[PDB]
A paper describes a structure:
Following an extensive screen of prokaryotic homologues with high (>40%) amino acid sequence identity to eukaryotic [name] transport proteins, we identified a suitable candidate from the thermophilic bacterium [name], GkApcT. To address these questions, we determined the crystal structure of a close prokaryotic [name] homologue in complex with bound l-alanine and l-arginine ligands and studied its transport mechanism using in vitro biochemical assays. GkApcT was determined to be proton-coupled, with uptake of l-[3H]-Ala observed in the presence of a membrane potential, negative inside and a pH gradient, alkaline inside. Crystal structures of APC superfamily transporters have revealed a conserved ‘5 + 5 inverted topology’ fold, wherein the first five TM helices are related to the second five helices via a pseudo two-fold symmetry axis running parallel to the plane of the membrane.
In particular, Met321, Ala119, Val317 and Ile234 all adopt smaller side chains in the human proteins, being serine, glycine, serine and valine respectively. However, we discovered that Met321Ser was able to recognise and transport both l-Arg and l-Lys to a greater extent than the wild-type protein. Indeed, the affinity of this variant for arginine is significantly increased as demonstrated by a reduction in the IC50 value from 6 mm in the WT to 11.4 μm in the M321S variant. To further validate this result, we obtained a crystal structure at 3.13 Å of the Met321Ser variant with bound l-Arg. As expected, replacement of Met321 with serine substantially opens up the ligand binding site facilitating the increased size of the l-Arg ligand.
Author numbering:
A (entry chain A): 1 to 137, 141 to 461
B (entry chain C): 1 to 27
The structure:
């Protein structure tokens, strides 16, 4: 940690308390688990499982989910202790600002500004696949159905439309309902269980026999791909102002949501590859494709509808997590403060959701899903590594702190989170480093020409 | 958290009931 102006935890309580003073707190460990599951299950399991099975691991994609799941478990425990120690309405940016400080907080924040954005484009691309697949059986123009390659398509229009629709939704700001959230999440969980219950009757173990055709090398490169599917448990700390006793219900919501998805993910990979041979799984809607391939067409409509109504929740959470990140970074002074009128004569701090949304809408319509997922994955992995180290830093500096939940084993588990994650980063392409490093160099320039012009310069 | 646990289990069973129903009338 270089050039550290740590934010005092007392100051984070005052901001999370002033913003959440009018809000009614009544959420529990179940509502927070719905907030986690509703932000995890999406394009990663519904779409990326097909490409990862076909071209990375094969039937051994279950080991890819176990290795990738193990990395997220160790990292989720670190996020949990931060949510238990710093129970503020903030994520890895607010945690790094209190443990490392300014420079590390800005790099991670600048890293997350992109990670939430590229993931928003990635979630919408997979959403466009299931929406188009559900329509056929109809089809739009052939030139407006995917990214721009050498033969076929120009722009992904459905992915563009759903982004501008969620941008229109977040602009209105309909008061989110805790009961409405549990319904949409249960739709997602039931159709995943519906696939597993129906699909188990059609599993031929012959489709498992070439278990590791690409070897463990392909198991590892697939683990970095479906690592995308586990992201979302960090969104539990969003409603930190609306929880009675956040010190213990937020760690519960984080871990319980992740472990539930891990079991469902391990189950889907085994059934999906057991039904369809892995070579035929490279398709935009593998779960709906698996039900069609095996003559269960009527159920493939249910799963396609639950995916349409379920993936659209991950997109709402992702773009909000990016919008709220602009609100917090500019509040800390590291970005220019924008303002707009909320009443005819009362102006408030403003973040242009139509510009951040239009930027997401562009990339969702021209970039293929495998690239957006990989670029999202390098951003999430570095943010995961920083938090896993920050726990050990917060253990050494400020040890006598209130920790309702604390990581099981003091050094071993956070170190394992770092090694597991850092091993996954090595299995990503080198071109993913191009857009990621050059993005950090742009932010590193911003910090040394404007970052030291903030609410903590003095 | 109280009543929301029921609305979760309800529509979960409603979807699985209709899903189990459609899967029986196929192939
Ligand atoms: C809890 C789970 C595992 C069991 C309930 C799921 C439902 C959907 C199951 C239970 C019995 C199943 C049926 C049993 C036998 C056959 C014949 C064969 O052609 C496969 C399809 C078909 C017609 C199955 C379709 C799915 C089915 C109706
Ligand atoms: C083996 C017998 C296989 C018989 C499959 C039933 C024929 C049928 O209509 O299957 C649905 C089809 O896959 C979509 O319409
Ligand atoms: C029967 C239907 C009745 C519907 C009645 C209206 C229900 C809310 C409307 C839209 C949902 C999108 C709300 C968008 C604003 C909430 C922001 C958001 O999603 O934030 C992420 C949060 O952590 C988790 O939602
Ligand atoms: N902050 C993020 N990177 N969010 C991405 C959420 C992706 C989600 N797990 C899915 O598979 O759809």
């Amino acid at each position: 940690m270089n050039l550290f102006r740590k934010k005092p935890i007392q100051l984070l309580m005052k901001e999370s308390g002033a913003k959440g003073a009018s809000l009614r707190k009544e959420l529990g460990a179940f509502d927070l688990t719905m907030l986690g599951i509703g932000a995890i299950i999406g394009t990663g399991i519904f779409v990326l499982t097909g490409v990862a099975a076909a071209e990375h691991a094969g039937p051994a994609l279950v080991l890819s989910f176990i290795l990738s799941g193990l990395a997220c478990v160790f990292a989720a425990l670190c996020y949990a202790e931060f949510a238990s120690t710093v129970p503020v309405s903030g994520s890895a940016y607010t945690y790094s600002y209190a443990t490392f400080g300014e420079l590390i907080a800005w790099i991670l924040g600048w890293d997350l500004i992109l990670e939430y954005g590229v993931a928003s484009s990635a979630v919408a691309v997979g959403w466009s696949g299931y929406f188009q697949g559900l329509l056929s059986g109809e089809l739009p123009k052939a030139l407006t159905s995917a990214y721009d390659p050498a033969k076929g398509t120009f722009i992904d229009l459905p992915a563009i439309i759903i982004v501008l629709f969620i941008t229109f939704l977040l602009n209105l700001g309909a008061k989110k309902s805790a009961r409405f959230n549990a319904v949409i999440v249960a739709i997602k969980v039931a159709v995943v269980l519906l696939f597993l219950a129906v699909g188990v009757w059609y599993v031929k173990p012959e489709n498992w026999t070439p278990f590791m055709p690409y070897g463990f090398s392909g198991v590892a490169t697939g683990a970095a791909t479906v690592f995308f599917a586990y992201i979302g448990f960090d969104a539990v700390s969003t409603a930190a102002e609306e929880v009675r006793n956040p010190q213990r219900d937020m760690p519960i919501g984080i871990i319980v949501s992740l472990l539930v998805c891990t079991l469902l993910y391990i189950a889907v990979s085994l059934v999906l590859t057991g039904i369809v041979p892995y070579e035929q799984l490279n398709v935009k809607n593998p779960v709906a494709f698996a039900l069609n391939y095996i003559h269960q067409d009527w159920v493939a409509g249910f799963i396609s509808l639950g995916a349409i109504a379920g993936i659209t929740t991950v997109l709402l959470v992702s773009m909000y997590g990016q919008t709220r990140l602009f609100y917090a970074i500019s509040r800390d002074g590291l970005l220019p403060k924008v303002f707009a009128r909320i009443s005819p004569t009362r102006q408030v701090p403003y973040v242009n959701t139509w510009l951040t949304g239009a930027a997401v809408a562009v990339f969702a319509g021209i970039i293929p899903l495998n690239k957006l997922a990989e670029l999202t994955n390098i951003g999430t992995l570095f943010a995961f590594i920083t938090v896993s180290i920050g726990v050990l830093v917060l253990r050494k500096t400020q040890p006598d702190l209130k920790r309702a939940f604390r990581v099981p084993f003091v050094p071993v588990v956070p170190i394992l989170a770092v090694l597991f994650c850092g091993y996954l980063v090595l299995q990503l392409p080198a071109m993913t480093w191009i857009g990621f490093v050059s993005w950090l160099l742009i932010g590193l320039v911003i910090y040394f020409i404007y970052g030291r012009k903030h609410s903590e310069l003095n | 958290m109280l009543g929301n646990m029921n609305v979760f289990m309800a529509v979960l069973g409603i979807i699985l009931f209709s899903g189990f129903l459609a899967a029986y009338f196929s192939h």
